[PDB]
Write a protein that binds this ligand. Structure first.
Ligand SMILES: CCCN(CCC)C(=O)c1cc(C)cc(C(=O)N[C@@H](Cc2cc(F)cc(F)c2)[C@H](O)[C@H]2CN(C(=O)c3ccccc3)CCN2)c1
Length: 387
């Protein structure tokens, strides 16, 4: 049974532009769409005009606004923003029926942060205080929510990829998934939930113990898979892999899909590939299994993703087109939005663990489905973690 009906279907968006939830800030409430980001820890909103924003937070209109008299600078891999710290009353209309006083970074300047047509005006960093900017004394939103209310210290995400392109009007009208705050809604998944420990509380860090491409072991020292860390990040589109793992994975994926030759630009994640309407050769592309450390000593489980997850639908014509949504990383493994689209992901902060189950909305075909299976006997899994 599904017990959180008020929060089911509260997300919109897509992997390439991010998934967002509606929130309100201030008194009277100012409605804004907010990017759900498990890869950062600041709550920040556009607070000044920007060409890609059609609304922004107006602090002078909020009776409950409190100025913290301090600036904040947040650089990300490519995008960045700077703003002014303050606090205000915050609510989530399709969330728990509570109002909390939270820190808000009012974005005054930004560069390649806001995305044209994404429909979001701010970001909700759901990770831990350790990585909050300027420092860990800036309480993240979720920490404030749990401290001020009876909301349990857990949230879960079901990101729903459509499996095809959504134009501007379609993406605004479509249900992009669910963020269940304080619980697990059992209607959002099939099979069982398997848990992996959160290695450390900064990013949502996990440990990958084995990798397979169509059942074939990538056969790398497991430390390579987590070099320098492995994280679950809804604020990044792609599955990102450490340089050496990416080189081994692409070589194996190419070998598995060898009946069709794709250009270098495709494997670099830059160029789209197209097939006549309905003819995408899903069967030629391999499944990818990531084995994760289990909660029981010497036990692991695996999550299996299809090309329907790692090939991101893009519009070109009546052709079905995609980009390869696996990228090289110099900052460790990133289980991005395309991977999370295959699963219902439980961020169980209370029990320092992350759960995975097959998503009720994952894209698949009549021959193969995503999977979450276990247990497997795995030795010396602690050695897989990088120091
Ligand atoms: C999601 C839509 C598509 N899209 C963005 C538009 C192309 C991408 O796929 C995309 C591609 C790449 C390459 C990177 C990122 C990215 O930086 N995402 C952040 C959120 C975000 C979402 C946005 F929409 C726009 C942003 F500017 C920022 C996460 O919080 C990171 C930030 N981190 C670091 O920078 C870091 C700090 C220290 C060390 C290493 C890394 C920590 C991990 N978590 C996103």
């Amino acid at each position: 049974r599904g017990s959180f009906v008020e929060m089911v279907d509260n997300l919109r968006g897509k992997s390439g532009q991010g998934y967002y939830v509606e929130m309100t800030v201030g008194s009277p409430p100012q409605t804004l769409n907010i990017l759900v980001d498990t890869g950062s820890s600041n709550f920040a909103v556009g607070a000044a005009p920007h060409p890609f924003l059609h609304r922004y937070y107006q602090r002078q209109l909020s009776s409950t606004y409190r100025d913290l008299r301090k600036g904040v600078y947040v650089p990300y891999t490519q995008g960045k923003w700077e703003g002014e710290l303050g606090t205000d009353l915050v609510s989530i209309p399709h969330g728990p029926n509570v109002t909390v006083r939270a820190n808000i970074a009012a974005i005054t300047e930004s560069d390649k942060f806001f995305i044209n047509g994404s429909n979001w005006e701010g970001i909700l960093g759901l990770a831990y205080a350790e990585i909050a900017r300027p420092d860990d004394s800036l309480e993240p939103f979720f920490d404030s929510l749990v401290k001020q209310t009876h909301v349990p210290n857990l949230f879960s995400l079901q990101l729903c990829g459509a499996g095809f392109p959504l134009n501007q009007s379609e993406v605004l009208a479509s249900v992009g998934g669910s963020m269940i705050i304080g619980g697990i809604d059992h209607s959002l998944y099939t099979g069982s939930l398997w848990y992996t420990p959160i290695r450390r509380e900064w990013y949502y860090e996990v440990i990958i113990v084995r990798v397979e491409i169509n059942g074939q072991d990538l056969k790398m020292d497991c430390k390579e898979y987590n070099y320098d860390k492995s994280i679950v990040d809804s604020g990044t589109t792609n599955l990102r892999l450490p340089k050496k793992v990416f080189e081994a994975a692409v070589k194996s994926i190419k070998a598995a899909s060898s009946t069709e030759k794709f250009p270098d630009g495709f494997w670099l994640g830059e160029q789209l590939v197209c097939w006549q309407a309905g003819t995408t050769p899903w069967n030629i592309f391999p499944v990818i299994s990531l084995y994760l450390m289990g909660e029981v000593t010497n036990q692991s489980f695996r999550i299996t993703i299809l090309p329907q997850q790692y090939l991101r639908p893009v519009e070109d014509s009546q052709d079905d087109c995609y980009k390869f949504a696996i990228s090289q990383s110099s900052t460790g493994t990133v289980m991005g939005a395309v991977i999370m689209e295959g699963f219902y992901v439980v961020f169980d902060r209370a029990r320092k663990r992350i759960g995975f189950a097959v998503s009720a909305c994952h894209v698949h075909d009549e021959f193969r489905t995503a999977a979450v299976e276990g247990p497997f006997v795995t030795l010396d899994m602690e050695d897989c973690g990088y120091n």
